UniProtKB/TrEMBL annotation:
SMART domains noted in UniProt: KH
Protein name per the record: Small ribosomal subunit protein uS3
GO cellular component: cytosolic small ribosomal subunit
Domain (KH type-2) ranges: 37-105
UniProt superkingdom: Bacteria
Subunit structure: Part of the 30S ribosomal subunit. Forms a tight complex with proteins S10 and S14.
Keyword Ribosomal protein found: yes
NCBIfam families attached to this UniProt entry: rpsC_bact
Summary of the function given for this chain in its UniProt record: Binds the lower part of the 30S subunit head. Binds mRNA in the 70S ribosome, positioning it for translation.
Pfam families assigned: KH_2, Ribosomal_S3_C
RNA sequence: AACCAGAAAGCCACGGCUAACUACGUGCCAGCAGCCGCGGUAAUACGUAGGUGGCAAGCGUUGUCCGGAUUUAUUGGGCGUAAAGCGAGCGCAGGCGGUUUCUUAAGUCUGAUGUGAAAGCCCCCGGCUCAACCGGGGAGGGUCAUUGGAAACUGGGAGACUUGAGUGCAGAAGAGGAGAGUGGAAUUCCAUGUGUAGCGGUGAAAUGCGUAGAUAUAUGGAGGAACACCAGUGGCGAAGGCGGCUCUCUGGUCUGUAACUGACGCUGAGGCUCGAAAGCGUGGGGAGCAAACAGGAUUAGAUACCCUGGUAGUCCACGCCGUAAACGAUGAGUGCUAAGUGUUGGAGGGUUUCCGCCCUUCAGUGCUGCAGCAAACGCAUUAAGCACUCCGCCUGGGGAGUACGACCGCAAGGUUGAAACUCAAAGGAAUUGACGGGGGCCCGCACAAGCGGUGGAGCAUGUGGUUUAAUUCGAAGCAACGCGAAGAACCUUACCAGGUCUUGACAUCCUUUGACCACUCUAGAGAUAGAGCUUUCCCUUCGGGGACAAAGUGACAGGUGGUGCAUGGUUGUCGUCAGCUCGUGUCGUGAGAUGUUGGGUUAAGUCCCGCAACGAGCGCAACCCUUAUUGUUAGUUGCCAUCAUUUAGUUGGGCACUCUAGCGAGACUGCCGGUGACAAACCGGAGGAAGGUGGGGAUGACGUCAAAUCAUCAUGCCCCUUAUGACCUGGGCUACACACGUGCUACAAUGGGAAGUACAACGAGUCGCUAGACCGCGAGGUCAUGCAAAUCUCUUAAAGCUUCUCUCAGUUCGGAUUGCAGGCUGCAACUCGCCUGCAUGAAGCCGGAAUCGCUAGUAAUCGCGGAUCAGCACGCCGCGGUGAA
């Protein structure tokens, strides 16, 4: 293995972090509290399945916001689930949290959601070649410049591991005026454990 | 004729061929199969389930005959490499044959006549209410038999012709054959002279020969074998084969020409002859060379390769055997079908001292290439092309050219030549990878040139081995060994001795209940035990759970236990090596190829030119960070130039310089000259701070190694559970008869010791760095001031510079080891921290074989800061000074 998480290459240059803090003498407390913050959307991710959470911070307030493609289950029926999530998050926090919902557009051109969906087809015993090809076509139908895909492990419920994936379009990986995305996700039907990786490119 | 759909349906397969399915318990065992092949938690091959799928009382299995099988090919196959042209010639019998006149009519076709039993298979028509039965007709049963005709073709008879086939006469070439003599050189032996300590051989040596005079050098003498240059893809012959020269017998081929014979030809089973080396018998000679054999060497072993010897043989005469990779792996005879180019032997013409030259034509003999053939490679007037005549041979690989029988031979052996039983392949040619102890080109501190090192000595540190009760686990060539460990006294821990415990040390629910705790005393090594103060409601609609404990068992928990060869994720390594592919159009019967090859150039698939290729993508490069100049902006905690002050840029003042860091400019072959195809590019010059990607960093394609990891994490499967799980004390991973790797300090004079004396950069700081003062030989101790930061501290850096010193010694070098006295953090430095002082003073005078790093702010030397951290660094990460060959 030799390659790099590409979002860890472009950060600081053409994007930022997801924590816009500046904190001395209470830094690791908020770090291992934000670690607890990220875990709590496991209740979301089974249904709501958000992508990113941006957490800014005022003096004595908590001011967070999310990005997702499914605005249905996150807004509740009348916002009543929203205040319940604020209460359950504040029970772990004790501090004034003020959550927000931002909807993404052209939602098929994500990174985490497409890999999560193809891992979902892997968790229903659907064949890997046809699912990757229909996935990269329906991502190409969204309008892009390229998608790379790769899956590994004990493929298709078999013996000793292979690793193979397919690609189409262009993808300048080694260049810095890129604005690409990336996502890794596990997979298991019942045998061992697998993994999917997924790439896009849309110019700077 | 009275009443019923009641009395009244069967059988094998479903992985491909094979139309004709899906799912459940079975687990390389039991099993299945016509061929291909299936069985280790899947058998879509055992049983079950519905189905599915087939003809019409049947359906599967075994056995036998024909087809598919052009796999005996007459219709209808072949022999360069896949099975398959005898080793080659001479020829009896046989097969097949130039043109023409007349003639017979054997073969040939045809007319008529006689028969080819009945029943069958056919067709038409009737009945059998449709299968079966009969009836009348016709090809159906001949290579038939008799009688009558044609002479086109082949047989037969009579003749005719010269084109095929042979002797003329004239020439020509030639390692054609046998027999008889002869020439010189070279080796070996012998003799003679001269002349002394070695000669000979190998990768390296050794065996061997030599003072009983070798080797070497000149002179002769003996004998055998082979013929240096000429020598050529030249020549000769049916093949095997044939090269010094002179002579006798003798075979064959080519060119002219035509008076002469007049179809006399070709092929050729049986038979005969010739037939490389090796071998056999009888008799000769041995100069070399050399099977068998002896000795030396190599090797784990070497009944071989290597070296020193050495017989049969190799030679001649006379007999025998009769084989070869006897090959162009291509049978023989004849005819026909584009060119170009050498060369051997001729004939003719133009021209001519032709000896050259040019044109025409015969027989060989090479080389390149149309049509045509071929699975391809290839062949191609010397066909593997289009054909006719005759002969030989083949029908999957093994068994095996074996067995029996027969013939030949003195003998080895030769010629002719099967089956029982096995296998589902064996085989030819070409394409892509991979490999080679095959080759051509390139490139890197890879060699070479230098500089400094390691291996010698002392110490620190990491492995293997021995150890104990335990020395906890992983990592093994580059690509493990100052590596996970960026901090082992208890904790750290998994390793031991002991004290111990159990829905548990930790998670979720249920009820009883609701909130606990926390803290003092006693026991002890501790977990724990027994008391003590009591615990505690945050909604009250008398109705209740949220913050909480304890008890019950219930769910369950826990594993640093195994498998990186069941895994994800992550990382080494080729290696910053320069490659890896796609679309469209072309080539190839097809796998596939071309683009991506060739010339130049570059750090590079980077770019130019030619090229059935044209374009693109991932890589390379560019965008990113820092360093190298300058403009603007903004001036404190920064700096001091215009002046005063004060120890002092301090305080008045300015943003001038410096610095701080935002936005900007600047280096792109940018211009000129030469080289280069004018092209890419190469070499110089000016300008500038840097000119040829200015100097570094981050960035790591396709893929290789089942490389490393369950011991960061997650985890398929397997195992443990009043215990391999948990709590505590003490110990250990820090041992040492030994060997290896990595670092620190010296072996002193460019130096040690004493004194005085200057200049950096990065970063860190709240229970953290310490200003100043006092005391101490010191490690340091006390009072205390600044500091959450360009301000206060770490912190005034070492090598540096000037004076003295020592005077070559195991030394005023060196500084390990050991007693004593201490200092600091720790609850506690014995096992096991660091540092100070006194007393002690070992090896060690530049380190073999071998081996490592590095092409310039580099190598070499010298200090400083940080991470983890109460404490502990010769390790790691980073910065700066001096500065090489």
């Amino acid at each position: 293995g030799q390659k790099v998480h590409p979002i860890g290459m472009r950060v600081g240059i053409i994007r930022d972090w997801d924590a816009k803090w500046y904190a001395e003498k209470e830094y690791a407390e908020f770090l291992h509290e934000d670690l607890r913050i990220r875990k709590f959307i496991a209740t979301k991710l089974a249904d709501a399945a958000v992508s990113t959470i941006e957490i800014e911070r005022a003096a004595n307030r908590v001011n967070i916001s999310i990005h997702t493609a499914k605005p249905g289950m996150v807004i509740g029926k009348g916002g009543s689930e929203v205040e319940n999530l604020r209460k359950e998050l504040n029970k772990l926090t004790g501090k004034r949290v003020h959550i927000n919902i931002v909807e993404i557009k052209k939602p098929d051109l994500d990174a985490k959601l497409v890999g999560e969906g193809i891992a979902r087809q892997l968790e229903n015993r659907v064949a890997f070649r046809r699912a990757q090809k229909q996935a990269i076509q329906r991502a190409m139908r969204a309008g892009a410049k390229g998608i790379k895909t790769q899956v590994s492990g004990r493929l298709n419920g078999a013996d000793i591991a292979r690793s193979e994936g397919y690609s189409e379009g262009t993808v300048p990986l080694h260049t810095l005026r890129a604005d690409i995305d990336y996502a890794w996700e596990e997979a298991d039907t019942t045998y061992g454990k697998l993994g999917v990786k997924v790439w896009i490119y849309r110019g700077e």
